[PDB]
């Protein structure tokens, strides 16, 4: 199987991955729509998981004839890394429920709604590779200048992560032995703070605060939540505006 | 809704991992739409200024 | 207060009836003489005390009638005041057909959802409260139980059309107008450094002309 | 040795990769030890000890940091940039050990206020990268630029707040008994505090419908008072300040533009003044 049937393959790798990969890839997002669809579940659990299952047998074929493939480039496509990596969890959760026997829970546990979201992203791999055909030239021309101002927004989202974790560092100090029970922990405190940076009920933490005895905590958490507020989202609103603007200067 | 899954396994449970996972792509989504909304007005606003 | 409406009682008034900032204060001392001539001292029929601290702070807004930087930012914004009144009504208009419409849709039938699409200064309110984010999830709540599952899409298709439409085109008209109105003011400013700076170039030239004149003149005479 | 030995300890790469991989560890050690301090695993209970200990140690790696210190201007260094602020910031952090070996902190101990400084000391000197500081260049021209908005933000703020203190005065002062919005309107100070958050305009429709509790006076001058400051405020100001911004961002572009096209000029300039030198030789 050298450089002959490498060429063999890209050939042949053209044409029949052409084909069957469209066909069968159309036929798998139309069960798996199927599948999801929390009513159709019910007119079915015995046809579902059957052709779920053999689409994933199809999947794993690709991922043997990928695997037989040109090899070191296929790795150097991350949609490919992202189809491998896919595929090793696919047939981990595939021999994980053909062997049964086990040890730990099992009747729809947490591992039964991670291989779930599992699927999900499989079938979001399957859309991707249907739209191979007509993705549209406006919208594309959009999110390539959508994409355009990458490192402007990744260092905006970065400051905005350092100044949240700032935020939250301080509040967690200041909350101690103040009814925690809200953000006992680091989690909570960090979801805490995502609901005072976007606007969802700080008028009620100002008033089940005044039901408690620290006061000066409500200017603190307004100060914060007015600069990180007005100093982030004008950022970001300026910077895709100006983004976008030397697209408009343009033709 | 933060109420309503709240109290999965009181403590982690998936009540960290949904959240996490929806709460990041709502602020996400949230910021890109109202973005390409204000860019969009002024975009097709400067066809008004030429 | 009164001294100044002295001053403010000239001729000058010709040119206070047809300006900005000078109408704005004549008007603001009237409308602080006339209410607390009739509150100090009152003697009159009239209901309760609402215009203390409003009073007080029209006095607020003559003490920051000064400060000629704020000033030069109001006359680089006052060309907006047209198109702040065109979104206005504009809203008002969308405002007054999704009123009828909600009072049709919720408030004519009289099996509930009164004082939200019933009367019509709430629901005015309440129109006002679900074009903006505040509101929608108890309001929604509230409606869903009426028995009318189209409710729902309506009022989400009021939201997509109403919060985006008002929020994006007001910022997007204010961004580029006071783009447009500080462009301009900038290129004027810089305008008049290059007309000074080629004065001062001009006024070198002729000090050097004239001094070269009176060297060759001297050395001629010399 | 002194400064050359500053010199020589700031050149030197493993000191640098040294001091950041303490810095980065301190961060992730911080907030460990908050979790628990019980007997919920006996074990790990004198591990912990020796975590903080080694925050201890990071203290004493800052006090050799200022000897470090001492050996530049010294004197000068006192009165300087942000620098300044970094050494003032690892006083206030070296200060939890004297108040803790001599103040008995069984009190208002503020020793919460002095951690976070030195996180954010230390999430500032990070080695910051460069679209980093370019976007914080950005901002601090753009709040320079920001002279008189910010100003009348505040004046908009202190008329329209004094004027709605005595407004709804008979929602606080009001006797109803079943009430749970009445301390937004009593105060001065919670007069800011209720105006801040019409402002930010978050459940406005709740808080009109917890003000729809006072007798409805045929809604004539209060409610048209209450609607018309909060829309005023919210769209003027944000529609202002996000266009400030975009003018920051387009003079800075416009700055650079004239930039490049003087440089090309003057290549251009270059490229034909090389010709001449060439045709004179």
């Not at chain 4, 050990?97 to 951690?115: D, F, I, K, T």
Request: proline share 1%.
């Amino acid at each position: 199987l050298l450089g002959l049937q490498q060429m063999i393959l890209s050939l042949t790798q053209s044409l029949g991955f052409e084909t069957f990969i469209f066909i069968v890839v159309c036929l798998n997002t139309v069960i798996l729509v199927a599948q999801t669809f929390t009513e159709l579940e019910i007119r079915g659990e015995w046809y579902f998981m059957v052709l779920d299952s053999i689409f994933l047998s199809i999947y794993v074929l690709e991922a043997v004839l990928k695997l037989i493939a040109l090899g070191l480039e296929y790795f150097y496509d991350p949609w490919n890394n992202l189809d491998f990596f896919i595929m090793v969890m696919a047939v981990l959760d595939f021999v994980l429920l053909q062997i049964n026997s086990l040890s730990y829970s099992f009747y729809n546990h947490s591992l039964f709604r991670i291989l779930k979201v599992f699927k999900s992203m499989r079938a979001l791999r399957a859309i991707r590779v249907l739209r191979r055909l007509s993705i549209l030239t406006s919208l594309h021309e959009v999110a390539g200048t959508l994409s355009g101002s990458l490192p402007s927004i990744t260092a905006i989202l970065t400051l905005m992560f350092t100044c949240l974790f700032l935020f939250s560092v301080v509040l967690r100090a200041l909350f101690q032995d103040s009814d925690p029970k809200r953000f006992q922990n680091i989690f909570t405190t960090l979801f805490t703070l995502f609901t005072m940076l976007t606007l969802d009920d700080w008028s009620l933490i100002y008033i089940d605060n005044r039901a408690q005895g620290a006061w000066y905590i409500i200017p603190i958490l307004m100060i914060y939540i007015v600069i990180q507020y007005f100093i982030f989202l004008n950022l970001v609103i300026a910077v895709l505006v100006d983004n976008f603007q030397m697209a408009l200067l343009k033709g | 809704i933060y109420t309503d899954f709240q109290m999965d396994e009181r403590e982690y449970a998936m009540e960290v991992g949904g959240a996490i996972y929806f709460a990041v792509f709502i602020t996400l989504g949230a910021f890109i739409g109202l973005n390409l909304f204000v860019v969009v007005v002024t975009t097709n606003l400067e066809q008004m200024m030429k | 207060y009164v001294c100044e409406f002295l001053m403010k009682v000239y001729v000058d008034p010709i040119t206070y009836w047809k300006d900005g900032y000078n109408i704005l204060d004549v008007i603001i001392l009237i409308i602080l003489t006339i209410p607390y001539l009739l509150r100090k001292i009152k003697g009159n029929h009239s209901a309760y005390l609402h215009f203390a601290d409003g009073i007080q702070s029209l006095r607020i807004l003559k003490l920051i009638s000064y400060s000629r930087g704020i000033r030069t930012l109001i006359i680089a914004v006052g060309e907006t005041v047209y198109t702040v009144a065109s979104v206005l009504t504009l809203l008002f208009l969308l405002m007054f057909v999704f009123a009828i419409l909600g009072f049709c849709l919720f408030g004519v039938t009289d099996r509930g959802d009164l004082e939200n699409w019933g009367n019509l200064a709430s629901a005015f309110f309440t129109l006002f409260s679900l074009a903006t984010v505040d509101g929608w999830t108890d309001l929604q709540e509230e409606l869903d139980k009426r028995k009318f599952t189209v409710s729902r899409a309506f009022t989400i298709l009021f939201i997509l059309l109403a919060s985006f439409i008002f929020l994006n085109m007001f910022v997007g008209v204010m961004i580029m107008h006071t783009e447009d109105s500080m462009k301009k003011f900038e290129r004027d400013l810089t305008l008049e450094r290059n007309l000074a700076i080629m004065e001062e170039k001009q006024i070198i030239l002729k000090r050097q002309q004239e001094e070269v004149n009176r060297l060759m003149n001297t050395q001629k005479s010399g | 040795p002194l400064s050359l030995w500053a010199g020589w300890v700031l050149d030197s790469s493993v000191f640098s990769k040294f001091i950041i991989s303490l810095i980065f560890l301190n961060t992730f050690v911080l907030m460990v030890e908050i979790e628990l301090m019980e007997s919920t695993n006996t074990a790990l209970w004198p591990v912990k000890l020796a975590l903080e200990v080694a925050d201890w140690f990071i203290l004493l790696s800052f006090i050799v940091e200022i000897l470090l210190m001492w050996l530049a201007s010294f004197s000068l260094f006192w009165k300087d940039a942000w620098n300044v602020f970094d050494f003032f910031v690892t006083l206030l952090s070296l200060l939890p050990e004297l108040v803790v070996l001599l103040g008995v902190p069984a009190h208002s101990v503020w020793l919460q206020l002095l951690r976070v400084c030195r996180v954010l000391r230390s999430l500032k000197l990070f080695a910051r990268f460069r679209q980093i500081k370019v976007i914080l260049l950005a901002l601090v021209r753009a709040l320079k630029s920001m002279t008189f908005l910010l100003m009348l933000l505040l004046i908009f703020f202190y008329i329209f707040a004094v004027t709605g203190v005595y407004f709804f005065r008979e929602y606080s002062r009001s006797t109803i008994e079943g009430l749970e919005y009445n301390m937004f309107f009593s105060d001065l100070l919670n007069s800011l505090v209720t105006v801040f958050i019409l402002f930010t305009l978050d459940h406005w429709y709740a808080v009109l419908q917890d003000i729809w509790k006072v007798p409805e006076s045929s809604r004539v001058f209060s409610s048209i008072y209450v609607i018309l400051w909060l829309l005023l405020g919210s769209i003027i100001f944000r529609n202002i300040i996000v266009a400030m911004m975009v003018t920051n961002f387009q003079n800075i572009r416009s700055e650079l533009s004239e930039e490049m096209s003087h440089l090309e000029v003057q290549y251009k300039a270059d490229m034909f003044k090389q010709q001449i030198i060439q045709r004179r030789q």
